[PDB]
Amino acid sequence: MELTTRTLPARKHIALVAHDHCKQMLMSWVERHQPLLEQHVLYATGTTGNLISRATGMNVNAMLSGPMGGDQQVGALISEGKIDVLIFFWDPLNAVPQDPDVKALLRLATVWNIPVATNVATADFIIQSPHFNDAVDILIPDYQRYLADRLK
Amino acid sequence: MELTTRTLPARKHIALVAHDHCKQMLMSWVERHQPLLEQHVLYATGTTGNLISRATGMNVNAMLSGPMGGDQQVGALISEGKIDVLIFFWDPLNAVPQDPDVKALLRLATVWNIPVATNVATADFIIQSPHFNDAVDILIPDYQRYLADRLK
Amino acid sequence: MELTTRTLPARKHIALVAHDHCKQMLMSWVERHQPLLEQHVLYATGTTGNLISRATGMNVNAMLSGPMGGDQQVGALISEGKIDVLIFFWDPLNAVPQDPDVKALLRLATVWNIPVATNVATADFIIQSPHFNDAVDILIPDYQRYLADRLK
Amino acid sequence: MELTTRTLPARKHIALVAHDHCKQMLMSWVERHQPLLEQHVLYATGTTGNLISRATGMNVNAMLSGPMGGDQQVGALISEGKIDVLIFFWDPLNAVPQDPDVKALLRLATVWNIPVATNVATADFIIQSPHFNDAVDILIPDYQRYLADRL
Amino acid sequence: MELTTRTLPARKHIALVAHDHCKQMLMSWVERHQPLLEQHVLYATGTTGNLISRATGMNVNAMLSGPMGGDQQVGALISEGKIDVLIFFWDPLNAVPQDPDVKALLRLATVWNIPVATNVATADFIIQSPHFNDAVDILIPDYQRYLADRL
Amino acid sequence: MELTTRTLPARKHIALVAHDHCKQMLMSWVERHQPLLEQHVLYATGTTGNLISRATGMNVNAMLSGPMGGDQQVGALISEGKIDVLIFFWDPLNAVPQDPDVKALLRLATVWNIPVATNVATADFIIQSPHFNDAVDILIPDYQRYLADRLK
């Protein structure tokens, strides 16, 4: 449908989310890039958020735990254009009860066209990118026109 | 233990959501109960919310459209205890792309134990219940004890 | 789609189903409302059924266990107009093997427009509704007309 | 879990089901095997059943249409040991709203261990197999034991 | 859509896949038919493959374990016409994380119209079928015409 | 589980896949990055592969169409370590018949820890990252040890 533009700020609002068997990976990743991450705004789901702040002293805006709605809170923030980057390490080897929430979240990150990482390799390539700390124009769906065509 | 208590106010915060093929059904339902619904606070996804407001003249807090993240916004409000009742007329005869969002939303409504109607019959029974206009206590999981246990 | 009507008898045919982690939740709910439930016809899936009759002494028409086909037996009965109310406490925090059966059962309960509760709050609202003990009409899809078109 | 046995009678109770895009495929298959199928008991979902009846003239016990509950009716019969063979030509190239019912039906057919064909090739192999026309014993889960242990 | 034909060779390429809870049931099925299976070419997912080889001494082309991609490797071979029969005993009573890989594999087997068995009864009917050791023509999508219309 | 490492060659093996409604976006994206891509080895699903080679003249190893097995062929290549990067613009606003294949493919990409992009924003950050043209070590699961424990 109709697409418009949005500018990701130089200072990104990053969401960090990880499944239990993936928390250790996210932790190491975060500790390895702390100096850089400290330059942006950090958000996370309940458990993930607390484990990170307690371990690194970084300021993290913790949302509810994933199974309790954290994923949907993050999804909502992305739709509202309040989250610019999503680092979501989900477990591809273990059945998760909130699997629909997981798919719904990834679905929204895809439609709102924001940088998304589901593994370390992708996360490294993203944060080591030269424009990670710059303003970046992205194409996003034009809700205004979308809804307008719906009310006709 | 693992559960606590929440009190639903007399003036309920109602979320109204409907798939395209079920919108007429929801519209009719809303019209036949405009008198009572006017005494409560209404929320709704994009398209649904506008249609209702333009047809009945009631104040409706419209969020994004479902496919664009509206379901997750509703789910978020529910997890935050800002939505007391959910009327979600999803289409059981049509496949939708935001199906994971649909499932995730119903999953949260189940978790947070709030009144949920997925069809007209259930909506009618719920709205005709006595203390529907009264303050009612519901059992909800104790998030504090939950998160605390997570961070052991 | 064409719609016709069906009359819910005063003495409702209630199906009671609960996943393992919600069984104590359902049991407790049934005992609290025994004086009321005793006035209706009860049906349930294998395990749930036996646990109820053995704990309350009430007569329950037990079907097969969910995983073994119980869910579909209930779905069939619903489509056939033999079940008027569905109380299905599925687990929102645990993945189950018969998940497709769960979704298929809730899909049909939605299609045939009967009161459905997936949590305690909704269930309480339904049974306290004034017409829970009266005969009431509900709108249902007109199958004959639906099939005629299919063969048109 | 403990297993027991069930006998599949010579005269089989067959459930015939097909998605719209696969109906023609099932119709052709049923027509070229009519002489044999006429010897067994046929069951089908609503639309499929009616189409087969008027096209071949055979007697078919039509259940409700799939989207309307037909699939679960068939599942119910299978779990009750009333269906011996399932011919389900579902469409692998088109999204279906009753997808959960489709997966649920197939899950049950697996559980109760009855012959199941989801395509023509499997359907042909099945009906050309010797035990299709005679009684044969199959292993099934022992429900009694299963339920007893649950309690 | 547009169809064409393929001929399964008398000597079939069989893929054997089973979830943990169904492995033993697959082992018993294999040994019970070893004489016949010995005359064919066997493929299997990682764990399943090695278990069969070590127990019967039959040669088996072992692929990666299912969760690691083995289901997709089998799916790939099927679409390439390298697999003629699929014996997939998936667990109908236990959810697996690679559930999508399971559905995708079954979806392809359906599309490419090859004999497929998800339980013992179906597997026995197919294996006991007369033309199991003969060349058999099956109808398959005409990929050429298919891709041609796309562009 | 036990992990090991793998080195992604400087000259990457890239898989390009896109759903119909996303083909135009991928196309123009490839054209705008043609100079970079020309120095690598490209793979793609049926339709997508031909459209690209036809419009850019680049050499593309085309597999089968996704709905016909293409996604599984790609997943197979990934698990075998023959694909280093995956660009998959799947349609988040459309229900696809091969949905399971789509998820299975994304699941493997996650498991094998290779760079993956599902939208333009992510694709741009990845291709501009410095290590894109350099040999890179990634953490992958140790299959040998994994399989050995399975046969214990």
What DSSP assignment string belongs to F57-99? ---EEE---GGGTHHHHHHHHHHTT---EEEEE--TTS--TTH
**Cβ-based contacts of C103 with chain D (< 8 Å):** 100, 104
Contact E94 C96 (CB under 8 A): no
Instruction: List Cα–Cα distances, C93 to A101, B17, D49, in angstroms.
Output: 12, 24, 40
CA gap E51, F40 in Å, rounded: 40
Q: Count the neighbouring beta carbons within 10 Å of the beta carbon of residue E1.
A: 10
Measured distance CA(B89)–CA(B105) in Å, rounded: 12
Q: Is it the case that chain B and chain C have 3 or more CB pairs lying under 8 Å apart?
A: yes
Q: Confirm or reject contact between E133 and chain D (CB < 8 A).
A: no
Q: Please report, as a single letter, which amino acid is at residue C149.
A: D
* Set of chain B residues whose Cβ sits within 8 Å of the Cβ of F100: none
Catalytic one of B71, B101, B142, B149: B71
* Sequence letter at residue D47: T
Q: Are E15 and E71 in contact (CB under 8 A)?
A: no
Distance CA C66, CA D100 (A): 15
Phi, psi at residue C119, to the nearest 5°? -145, 170
Residue of B nearest to D68 (CA): B93
Cβ(A123)–Cβ(F138) below 8 Å:
no
**Residues A36, A23: Cα–Cα separation, whole Å:** 20
Report the distance separating Cα F19 and Cα F24, nearest Å. 10
Half-sphere exposure of C80 (CA within 13 A, CB side): 15
Query: Are the C-beta atoms of C65 and D147 separated by less than 8 Å?
Result: yes
Angle (CA) A132-A103-A28 rounded to 5° is 45
Q: Is chain F in touch with chain E: ≥3 Cβ pairs within 8 A?
A: yes
Q: Which long-range contacts (CB under 8 A, 24 or more apart) does B6-10 make?
A: B6/B81, B6/B137, B6/B138, B6/B140, B7/B135, B7/B136, B7/B137, B7/B138, B8/B84, B8/B85, B8/B114, B8/B135, B8/B136, B8/B137, B8/B138, B9/B84, B9/B135, B10/B133, B10/B134, B10/B135
The sign of the dihedral angle between the CA atoms of E119, E125, E128, E133 is: negative
Tokens, residue E41: 């070419």
Of A46, A69, A104, the CB nearest to B100: A104
Nearest C-alpha neighbor of F38 from the set F18, F25, F52: F52
Helix, strand, coil in percent for chain E, rounding step 5? 50, 20, 30
CA E133 to CA E126: how far, in whole Å? 11
Shortest CA distance to E118 belongs to which of C97, D16, D117? D117
Reported as half-sphere exposure (CB side, CA atoms, 13 A), residue D98 has a value of 23
Closest-CA residue to F20 (of F43, F42, F51) = F51
Phi, psi of C39 (to 5 degrees): -85, 0
Q: How far is F80 from chain A (nearest CA, A)?
A: 17
Residue E92: list chain D partners with CB under 8 A: 107-108, 110-111
| Partner E contacted by C97 (CB < 8 A) | yes
Q: Do C72 and D76 touch (CB under 8 A)?
A: yes
* Tokens representing residue E14 in the block: 């069989």
Report residue F99 as tokens.
Answer: 């949905």
Nearest to F125 among A111, A115, A121 (CB): A115
Residue E31 sits in a domain whose CATH number is: 3.40.50.1380
3-state class of B22 per DSSP?
A: helix
User: Nearest-CA distance from A14 to chain F in Å?
Assistant: 14
Separate counts of helices (H) and strands (E) for chain E: 7, 7
User: DSSP 3-state assignment of C130?
Assistant: helix
Resolution number, Å: 2.2
Does B115 reach chain A within 8 Å, measured CB to CB? Answer: no
The backbone torsions φ and ψ at residue B6, rounded to the nearest 5 degrees and listed phi first, read -135, 145
What are C5's strand-pairing partners? C139
* Touching partners of B (3+ C-beta pairs < 8 Å): A, C, D, F
Q: Which of F78, D10, F46 is nearest to A119 (CA)?
A: F78
Does residue B94 sit in helix, strand or coil? coil
Pairwise CB contact (< 8 Å): A94 & E99 = no
Residue type, D17: V
Q: State the amino acid at position B109 in one-letter form.
A: A
Phi, psi of C7 (to 5 degrees): -105, 120
Q: What's the structural domain count of chain B?
A: 1
Given an 8 Å threshold on Cβ–Cβ distance, is F125 in contact with A126?
yes
Nearest to F61 by CA among F15, F30, F105: F15
Kindly state whether A92 is in contact with chain E, defined as any CB-CB distance less than 8 angstroms.
yes
Query: What tokens appear for F81 in the block?
Result: 């370590």
Q: If we measure between CA atoms, which residue out of C9, C7, C44, C10 comes closest to residue C29? A: C44
Nearest CA to E109 out of E28, E17, E36 is that of E17
| Coil, helix or strand at residue D138 | strand
- Compute the distance between CA of residue B68 and CA of residue A107 in angstroms, rounded to an integer: 10
Specify the DSSP class assigned to residue E14: E
Its sign, for the CA torsion A134, A139, A140, A146, is: positive
How many separate helices (H) and strands (E) can be counted in chain C? Answer: 7, 7
Please report residues of A whose CB lies closer than 8 A to that of E67.
93
Structure tokens at E94: 């236990």
**Alpha-carbon distances of D105 from A5, B6, D102, rounded to whole Å:** 46, 40, 5
**Residues of F with CB below 8 A from E46's CB?**
147, 150
- How far is Cα E72 from Cα F71, in angstroms, rounded to an integer? 9
**CA distance linking residue F118 with residue F112, whole number of Å:** 16
By the 8 A CB rule, do E71 and E101 touch?
A: yes
In terms of Cα–Cα distance, which of F8, F4, F3, F2 is closest to F137? F8
The catalytic position among F71, F99, F142, F149 is F71
Q: Would you name the residues of D annotated as active-site residues?
A: 71
The one-letter code for the residue type at C42 is L
> Could you tell me if F54 and E39 are in contact, meaning their C-beta atoms sit under 8 angstroms apart?
no
Q: HSE of F42 in the Cβ direction (CA atoms, 13 Å)?
A: 25
Say yes or no: B91 contacts chain D, CB-CB below 8 A: yes
Element (H, E) at F124: helix F120-128
F57: exposed, middle or buried (C-beta count within 10 Å: 0-12, 13-18, 19+)?
Answer: exposed
Is the Cβ pair A67, C93 closer than 8 Å?
yes
Contacts of C96 in chain E (CB under 8 A): 95
d(CA B24, CA E95): 38
Amino acid at B147: L
Residues from chain D that touch B91, judged by Cβ atoms under 8 A, are: 97
Residues of chain A with C-beta less than 8 angstroms from the C-beta of C97: none
Six-digit token string for C97: 């093997």
Domain of residue C26 covers: 1-152
C-alpha to C-alpha distances, C47 to C44, D151, F34, F136, nearest whole angstrom: 8, 7, 63, 55
Look up residue E135 and give its two tokens: 């060349």
Q: Rounded to an integer, what distance in angstroms lies between the CA atom of residue E123 and that of residue C100?
A: 24
Alpha helices (H) along D11-130: 23-32, 34-37, 46-56, 70-79, 99-111, 120-127
- Say if C67 is an interface residue toward chain E (CB within 8 Å): yes
User: D95 touching F, CB under 8 A?
Assistant: yes
List CB contacts of F124: < 8 A, sequence separation 6 or more.
A136
* Nearest CB neighbour to F113, from listed A108, A111, A121: A121
Is residue C70 within 8 A of residue D107, CB to CB? The reply is no
> In the numeric block, which tokens belong to residue B18?
């409907």
Half-sphere exposure of E18 (CA within 13 A, CB side): 24
Rounded distance between C-alpha atoms, residue A93 and residue E57, angstroms: 31
Task: Please indicate whether, in this complex, the C-beta atoms of D93 and F97 are within 8 angstroms of each other.
Answer: yes
| Residue of chain D whose alpha carbon sits nearest to that of C143 | D68
Residue from A119, A132, A139 to probe the interface with F (highest F Cβ count within 10 Å) = A119
Q: Which chains touch F (3 or more CB pairs under 8 A)?
A: A, B, D, E
Q: B89: part of which helix (H) or strand (E)?
A: strand B85-89
Q: What is the 3-state secondary structure (H, E, C) of E87-148?
A: EEECCCCCCCCCHHHHHHHHHHHHHCCCCEECCHHHHHHHHCCHHHHCCEEEEEECHHHHHH
Chain center to CA of B91: 16
Residue B41 touches partner C, C-beta closer than 8 Å: no
Q: Angle at CA A90, nearest 5°, toward A84 and A92? A: 140
Q: Looking at chain C, which subunits does it touch, using at least 3 CB pairs closer than 8 Å as the criterion?
A: A, B, D, E
Tokens of E70: 């083995």
Tokens of D67: 């989207």
DSSP per-residue codes, chain A:
--EEEEEE-SS-EEEEEE-GGGHHHHHHHHHHTHHHHTTSEEEE-HHHHHHHHHHH---EEE---GGGTHHHHHHHHHHTT---EEEEE--TTS--TTHHHHHHHHHHHHHTT--EESSHHHHHHHHTSTTTTS-EEEEEE-HHHHHHHHT-
Instruction: Using the structure block, give the residue that is written with the tokens 């990170």.
Output: A52
Instruction: Please work out, in degrees rounded to the nearest 5, the angle formed at the alpha carbon of residue E66 by the alpha carbons of E95 and F152.
Output: 95
The β-bridge relationship of strands F136-141 and F3-8 is antiparallel
Nearest-CA neighbor of D82 among D109, D55, D117?
A: D109
Closest CA to E84 of E137, E21, E145: E137
Give the Cα separation of F112 and A118 in Å (integer): 11
Chain B meets chain E (3+ C-beta pairs below 8 A): no
CB of C45 within 8 A of CB of C74? Answer: yes
The shortest C-alpha distance from A45 to chain C (Å) reads: 17
CB contact under 8 Å between E93 and C95, yes or no, is no
Tell which residue, D56, D108, D54, has the closest CA to residue D80: D108
Sorted by sequence, the CB contacts under 8 Å of residue E51 that are 6+ apart come out as E23, E27, F151
User: CA of C69 to nearest chain D CA: how many angstroms apart?
Assistant: 6
- What secondary structure letter does DSSP report for B98? T
Task: Please choose, from the candidates A79, A67, A82, the residue with its C-alpha nearest in 3D space to the C-alpha of residue A15.
Answer: A82
Cα separation, F51 vs F30, whole angstroms = 11
E65 sits in which H/E element: none
Rounded (10°) angle between helices A46-56 and B143-150: 50
Interface check F121 vs B, CB under 8 A: no
- Give the one of D65, D76, D141 whose C-beta lies nearest to C150's C-beta: D65
Question: What tokens does F71 get?
Answer: 């996604």
CB C114 within 8 A of CB C20: no
* Euclidean distance between CA atoms F91 and F73, whole angstroms: 20
Measured between beta carbons, the chain B residues lying within 8 angstroms of F93 are: 67, 97
How far is it, in rounded angstroms, from Cα C60 to Cα C15? 9
